[PDB]
Amino acid sequence: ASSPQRGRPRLNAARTTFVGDNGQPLRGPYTSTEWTAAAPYDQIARVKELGFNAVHLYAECFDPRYPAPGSKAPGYAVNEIDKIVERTRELGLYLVITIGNGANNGNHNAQWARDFWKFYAPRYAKETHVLYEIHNEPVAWGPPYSSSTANPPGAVDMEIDVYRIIRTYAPETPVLLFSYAVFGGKGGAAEALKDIRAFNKAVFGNENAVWTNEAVAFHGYAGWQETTIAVEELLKAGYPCFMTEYAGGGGLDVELTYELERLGVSWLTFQYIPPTGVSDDVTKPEYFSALVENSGLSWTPDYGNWPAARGVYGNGGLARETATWINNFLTGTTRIEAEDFDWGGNGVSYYDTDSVNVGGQYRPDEGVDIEKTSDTGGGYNVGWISEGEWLEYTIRVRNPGYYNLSLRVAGISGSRVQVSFGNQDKTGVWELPATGGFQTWTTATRQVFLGAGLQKLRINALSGGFNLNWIELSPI
Ligand SMILES: O[C@@H]1[C@@H](O)[C@@H](O)CO[C@H]1O
Ligand SMILES: O[C@@H]1[C@@H](O)[C@@H](O)CO[C@H]1O
Ligand SMILES: [Ca+2]
Ligand SMILES: [Ca+2]
Ligand SMILES: [Ca+2]
């Protein structure tokens, strides 16, 4: 290259999503040129510092009355869209361009959409960083668009016609199809498959076509659980997909983000690039960065060092899910070994006063001090604990409410800890019992009130003088 401009994103090896020119998912917030100036260069640039490598653009809002007299034709925002294209080009960002809806979400004007893409598909065909998303939420509110009673009918015909237009003028540009508002359950995937089959027959001559440069765009409005199921089922069917709009409503949907990361699916979140948008500002910590930081969510960003490289130790890299009760028994393990703190390093997933593990056991190349334990069950304990040290464990709380939090501890004298969950203090100062020896073990328990979701459990040592074997958490 002779600039930071990114190369064409392509379907990944696993055929789950589009990845960039380094094999990594596209991740990004949104902006709009539907009625405003292009977001300024400096604000677009900031997305790189938030771990993103892509921008979702709602380029123009369709006119429901087109082509009637006084209706607004596509192309009116060209000078603003050109600015977003150039800015993302120079910044080394991907750009996903779509048609927005304004007051008409779950609807479309077919002629307007065809005319939009006749203009814009050739215009950006040669911009390797740019992807085309046919039309935002064109049907109320999800699949099957191909049903005769879809509201409105005929959206698959629009998808087909627009696809033909795009591919005529922009033969190598990634195309994202459907943009389903509500994509949920095994049923949602099955209905989407009817749409896919119909589109495929019309465009490729075979209901079961293997896409080379297309994916299903979908939104998160079925909710994280049902959306995850629909995505899993579609992926099993052999069709890649791409998250193009979702929110926790109100801020990043941490749970859906986690699942998309797990599944290998690119995502565009519904928080905006300053100065303006119709939802929440992605640069305000409370709607994005704090949610990421508190949850323990991590990915490898294209630029910078945020989010920090980190993850769960053991448990197959999955967040440790809390157990529940059925009648009088526990459905899964409640015990998190102290020595199984998140990887990431000193100042990231733990803080240790010395970079060496002086105990030399279990994780000899990290800074936490670990020795063999003679407590019931064997294994290891964290030792050489001093004031200001801390340890983090990424967990996933299944249900909100009261939990018994237990620490398995040993100490010659008294000691003090405090425990945070998602960077919220749940214990205050917790005085720990002197047991009279560093391998004389007791279980200390305090009741805590937890919110549901992915969250870091952080143990803060307010003093030294204790060893820690394990942590247990169970609903009351
Ligand atoms: O379709 C709209 C678009 O016009 C913009 O307001 C972003 O939100 C979407 O729901
Ligand atoms: O944690 C203690 C450490 O402080 C040192 O006293 C050696 O024994 C360990 O168990
Ligand atoms: Ca150490
Ligand atoms: Ca230590
Ligand atoms: Ca242990």
Numbering used by the authors: 35 to 283, 290 to 516
Describing publication, verbatim:
The GH5 arabinoxylanase (CtXyl5A) derived from Clostridium thermocellum displays an absolute requirement for xylans that contain Araf side chains.
To understand the structural basis for the biochemical properties of CtXyl5A, the crystal structure of the enzyme with ligands that occupy the substrate binding cleft and the critical −2* subsite were sought. As discussed on below, the axial O4 of the Arap did not interact with the −2* subsite, suggesting that the pocket might be capable of binding a xylose molecule. Finally Tyr92 makes apolar parallel interactions with the pyranose or furanose rings of the three sugars.
